[model samples]
Target: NNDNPLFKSAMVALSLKISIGNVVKTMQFEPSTMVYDACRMIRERIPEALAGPPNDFGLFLSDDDPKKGIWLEAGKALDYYMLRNGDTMEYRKKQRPLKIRMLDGTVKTIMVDDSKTVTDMLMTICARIGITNHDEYSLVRELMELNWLDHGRTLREQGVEEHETLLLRRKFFYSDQNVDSRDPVQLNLLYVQARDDILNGSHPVSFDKACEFAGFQCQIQFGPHNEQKHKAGFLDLKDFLPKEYVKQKGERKIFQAHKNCGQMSEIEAKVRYVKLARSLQTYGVSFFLVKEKMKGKNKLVPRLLGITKECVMRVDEKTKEVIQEWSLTNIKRWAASPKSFTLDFGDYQDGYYSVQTTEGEQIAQLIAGYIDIILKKK
Candidate 1:
């Protein structure tokens, strides 16, 4: 067996190029053990290598500085020297592309790149750390997205950044022109109305009722007075009737007339005005029509006439149980027949009117007090 032709041939080949360094380098060992052995060999050769004159051969192995060594050899051994010296191989290992195991048991590889955002880096790290739960992992992603994860900035700075990012992102999703625009006051009103509607398990108060309750008559006419006077008269008197009586009267006269009239533009206009007015009431506006126009023989000839008044009763809070009432007089006579009218307590001056009420003052004061409270809280 020792003299076999194959073994003899291998021995002859190995003997021709055998060296201690080559033998140690060629050994198939674990990475950690190989590095340890290589370091030891480098240290052992250092003294002898330095003792000789710095010839090309000696300089190649003994050179402490890469810049002074033979280019080819220095390039070849630079990595090894860097590993054994102050340079940490562990950091190099960490710098390598990461392998992550996902919640679905799938493995993903993420390469470290300059363009990798903080969110991307965190997602990769979370996968590696076995954060397989999607929700929990999402939370981690959000923290990074929010720039709150591993942030080196001060708390105040981080908070400011977070707030700015949130504001910008929200603006993207909800623009200022969206819906009715971001009117805080209008939004508050809508919210309150929606809450009330939900709690009462009923739809919001109709604008017509709101307007009527606010003491306005809403009327719309589109014909010679003789052609539509009766229909207009019913609309003019709608607010004067009690809620139950109005419904009953509307069903008997207005509904019946609408069904029979087919489509009288005059009557239709009145109905539309009433419907729109009811809608406005829910937002705190009342509507009414205290007057009407008459036409002469010519269909296009229009004539304005004196206006009438409508009375509405509202309880005075100070008098508790005492029902104090006020009247809204011919508002149409005050200005060019207002095609549209609104009585706003907050900010209306031109062509709009106001009636003083203890309740209104109290409400305004309460709102101002709320503003003060919020300012103090801040």
Candidate 2:
């Protein structure tokens, strides 16, 4: 076997050419060269790929769509992969591209590696945009609102589509243009000096005693040459942290929640505590206009109901009592219309739940969302 010419040729390395992102290089490897060997060569050249193992990334043929792309197993030999002369390899991070949009009308394009979590994107946005903490931002897509995924997840794990644009909406503080900010501004002389240098925001504090207290407070509000572009569109009427007691009763706290809405705010930490604490006020659950059969009237009464993972519920407008709790499992099946929803049930006692529709197309998907979860349980 050692002297045979066929056996000798089988041990020899063959020249193979592969292309990645933008670079292509020729490599000599035996017919036994597996996906692992190819991965090492690609990682050393491609700047985007991680320097770990071949399995960390995926190998794709010219087929393009990730779903349809022919994949080679890490342990598979190249000889078995069917190569002729010029077939090329495409190297891409297992993680996908995320197009993030800011409230300032600016768009940011970033690669979200599988290892990075949603929070990473959050802080990176702060550094990239120059203001606001992770807790202050909101990301919305289509009609379904999404929050920072607490657990690290890939786009697939989080159910985020790679093709969609991620939108940023900040909680309004005190912007001159925004009509939603309705809070009092408490200010004093000490508050002025801090913008001067203390808090770095104090000198610009008070907007009244800015010049008298020395330090950096008075000089910099808006001189002719002063060039300033603050990332925050909202400004506080007074410094958020006051040195002395103000006549105002106290700082606001979030307490009451509309359990009536029945769904939790998808924007958990994304909003300020005051609003996050009060879900009914800030990010209220989406309501699908439902035509509830009135006990007394011949005509169907209109009722708006919120969808939760567990069940569908609505709050009675007159008495404010939570009613019509329909567990997800009991939903036989549901169909949606541009203006109404038909909820069917397997159990006879569980009658059909009807919803009024409107211009909103989300309820059309909302029923679909509930169906997905219900099927998983079965």
Candidate 3:
């Protein structure tokens, strides 16, 4: 194939620029060279900065937007993904789509680089989903326990692997102010997440309430339930009704309620569902069980800590009683360590309270976020 002088000259080595962030280095490669070997050559050409494993890096088409590029597979030849001489190829952490599950039980695959911070991915997700108020939401890995991703850390640093689906949910406590803009995306986002909580029994409600909520969901999903098509066992009761609610006792009520729904549109049903949820005690509140330190005492008592937009309260964990409450204005300062979160607020200077919990950092972020929201309002 190289016998002809013209053909030989045309098949000469390809010259290209390898870029990482703003820095670039020129490299020459033959068409026959595989991306796997070319990556190693480029990897050695640059000074070690990211210090990521050499294998963790891959080639991507360089573009103005770092976030918007596609990865070159390692096993393929450079000729397969051929670029013109002087064209740039990005040498950085591999970029791939991260599967994210939304509150409405739908999955969206988002393109992200392993080297990018969680905040970057979060912003990308919000931008794609039409969520302007991104601060109200967070991407969490829900396994046996919730792993709330840190905003500043890279996805690879946090052990976020490919094919794993992250749950997108409202991280902070919600207020009427959250929905003041009446953004359709925001409204649906809020409703779907709350719907999950209600159905999963995380947000407990009365039997009648469950039935009514089920009716709303049924109306939204199936429209006016057909008496012929929607009979017993037609829809999974477990799906629409709360997990904790007794299905046998409430099945008739739920069916009857769905029939009463008449001809309401999906949007109207969602609005009604959110309205009913807002009236519940658990609405827009995230509860944590923590050991609350007693005044001047070494011992800690078990308490249900509820963080809401309006206030932070210590409730009796077992009895569901509010023991003490601190409104937002009263919370002067709050901080968190790995194991504990502290709050200092009062008319007097000596007021201090601490709670022992593993989720201190997350708690701190939630409180800080709520404070930021309040500041914006004022």
Candidate 4:
């Protein structure tokens, strides 16, 4: 009773962390560890619980040895149950050695032993599932050897079997030119005229006259034009105006300086043109021209005349050399020839690309000359 009090104290302490009222309300006690010594006194009288006679007239005999009796019966019954439940002695027997075709196409066989089981066999089966069709026998063997059956099963369960719309929803953002919409020569001319206007300052002539002066016809639709006409004509002008203006101003200044020296020889002019072309080319303007126009000293007209004359003289000399090299015998030989050149003039204004190549070349020459001038001094 005194020890019982100690046990009760321990139980109460444990219950204090829980709901004491609920434990007190639901608690009950039972004692099964108690031993009784009444067997000796009751041996004379039959125990009421086992007094009934055994009926064994025709009971089936078990395969377990009768000598072993209860122990044998319990053991055999346990074995039978284990076998029926797929945990049998045979199932526990080492799995039949597995033979796998390795990734290298070599046949590999694993013997089943006491440590192997049907579970191991199932694992191997799953590991070889998708690899056989792929000729990845080596991978299969590695997976088998590494016991990657869990990963294999997971992938198999998550794999896509159909062309799902969700997969189709993935997309890539791409950018590419529409070749069908481009006109190569026309586009070239666009860049040519753009540089011309930029370098020469707005030509005094109208768009049509400007084209004519530049030795090309104005086919671009000034108003009510199609997309190609508009795009080719004005795109670069819009984008390249500032650069054009700066270049033109600089070229005019240099050319004026050259003219003030006056009456330069043809050879001298050719050298100047080549030098200028190289310079302009470096400055990103590979197209340009120099036209010769004489005028009396009438302020604007004389200044314009001088600049135009200088440009014309340079162009004439340059064209002569280009013509001779190509074996073309006439001035018109340098005329706009279609399907002959690859020219790309990035976006700029209208009337800008008409003489892109010529202007770009002239600009390159002028730039080269400018650099030569700077370096000669240095």
Best by lDDT: 3
Q: Choose 3 or 4, whichever is better by lDDT.
A: 3
lDDT of 4 by residue, 1-378 (tens): 345533444222211111111221111111111111111112223232123332111111122332211111211322222212111011011123455444335555644221223344334543555433221121111321122222122222222111211100101111211112145554443345344533354322222222222221112212222345433233333232233232332333332333333444433333333233223312221223333233464332111110121122121221112211111111121223321211222332122112323233333333334444445567
- Candidate 1's TM-score reads 0.16
Better of 1 and 4 by TM-score: 1
Candidate 1, 306-336: lDDT as tens digits:
1112222232221112132223322222222
**Order of the predicted models by TM-score, top scorer first:** 3, 2, 1, 4
Q: Which of the predicted structures, 1 or 3, would earn the higher lDDT when compared with the native?
A: 3
Clashes of each: 16, 18, 0, 66
Largest TM-score belongs to which candidate? Answer: 3
**TM-score, structure 3 vs. true:** 0.55
Cα lDDT for residue 215, candidate 4 = 20
What TM-score does each of the candidates earn? 0.16, 0.35, 0.55, 0.14
lDDT of 2 by residue, 79-127 (tens): 7877644456666555556788866577788665534555676666566
Overall lDDT per candidate, in order of appearance: 0.30, 0.48, 0.76, 0.26
Among all windows of 10 consecutive residues in model 4, the one with the lowest summed lDDT is 164-173
Candidate 3, 283: how far from true, in Å? 2.4
lDDT of 3 by residue, 292-351 (tens): 877798888877777877788776654455677788778878889988989888663575
Of models 2 and 4, which has the larger TM-score? 2
- What stretches of model 1 exceed 4 Å from their correct place? 1-243, 246-250, 256-261, 264-271, 274-283, 286-378
Q: What is the lDDT of residue 110 in candidate 3?
A: 83
Cα lDDT for residue 195, candidate 4: 41
